Amino acid sequence: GLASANVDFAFSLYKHLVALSPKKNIFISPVSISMALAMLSLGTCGHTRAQLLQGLGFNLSETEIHQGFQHLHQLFAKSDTSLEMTMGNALFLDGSLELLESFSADIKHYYESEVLAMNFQDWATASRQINSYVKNKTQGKIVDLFDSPAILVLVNYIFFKGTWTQPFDLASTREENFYVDETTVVKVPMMLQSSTISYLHDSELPCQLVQMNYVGNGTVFFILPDKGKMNTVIAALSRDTINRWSAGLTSSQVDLYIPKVTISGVYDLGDVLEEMGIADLFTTQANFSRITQDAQLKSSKVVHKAVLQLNEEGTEAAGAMFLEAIPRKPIILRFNQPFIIMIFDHFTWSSLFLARVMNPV
Ligand SMILES: C[C@]12CCC(=O)C=C1CC[C@@H]1[C@@H]2[C@@H](O)C[C@@]2(C)[C@H]1CC[C@]2(O)C(=O)CO
């Protein structure tokens, strides 16, 4: 099924990226990556198609996959007083190219994708056009997404605004030490609430964790590993671990200290995808025959960018992907050191956002 395959891709992508850049702040939107690459698969055939779908975790009909993302795209459109969420897709195309009927019909039906004309000869204008488009769609959260000129650009964006069901106490906020390294300490606004919170001191892993809900169906896990045990906890991240945590989490009195995190990241997913076995996309042997017949295309660059804001009232997260194609007693829990964030949807089981916070500033 889609829900199982998507979350397994989420953790594997996270793990591989963590290993590739071990000191960087990692904040990603796996569902964004899965939806963008699944939309791409509609334009692939042969060995490239099979390799992409298998890498995404799908047992190779294709219609089941795209109906699944159509389902997600619909449920992820919300605009209320305490909950706001949007998700979308777009295709930027040079005038020299024309999409095949079935491909453009499929991306518009299943992914509600806009197909927008573009002059790749003027890259300054082109990259300005795409950057502003993404900027507006994510409510100004994703700024300056754009690397090298390209005749086709595939885009996906996600914006999320959640409100804590248990908000942090504004008066309780103080500046605390956040210990980045053995030689690095930064000052950060540290939030505090003393509430009945779902808590688990893990006995099978060197970590302690809490679960908090947002107004609606959004939920978040904050995982604090024991000092120097970040990679032992990360390697264990799976469906079986999150299930056991969910079953283990018990209502407890917690003095919960989490910092006011404002982080961003830009990630070239080239090395990550090829580590996961998705390699044909980038080769001069790439099969992109269902996109267009006006040119044989390969992928030149795959980039993801995401931003995270945490405060006393809630969370504001946003993400964007682009693909360029060219011609072929209270328990004190203090998050004052590197920790893990997992934002999920209760309703669909979708991994919305994953984080490894090395430095909240
Ligand atoms: C593994 C699981 C069910 C099987 C599956 O294919 C996908 C997932 C990933 C997300 C998990 C989910 C369930 O376990 C319920 C979880 C933990 C959910 C995230 C939040 C959740 O809904 C709860 O926290 C339950 O209250």
Curated annotation (Swiss-Prot):
The keyword Signal applies. InterPro entries: Serpin_CS, Serpin_dom, Serpin_fam, Serpin_sf, Serpin_sf_1, Serpin_sf_2. It is found in: Secreted. The record marks C207 as: Conserved cysteine within steroid binding domain. One of its GO terms (cellular component) is extracellular space. Plasma; synthesized in liver. Has also been identified in a number of glycocorticoid responsive cells. Changing L75H: In CBG deficiency; Leuven; decreased cortisol-binding affinity. Glycans are attached at N59, N136, N217, N287. GO terms for molecular function: molecular carrier activity; serine-type endopeptidase inhibitor activity; steroid binding. N-glycosylated; binds 5 oligosaccharide chains. Proteolytic cleavage leads to an important conformation change. This reduces the affinity for steroids. Major transport protein for glucocorticoids and progestins in the blood of almost all vertebrate species. This is Corticosteroid-binding globulin. It comes from Homo sapiens (Human).
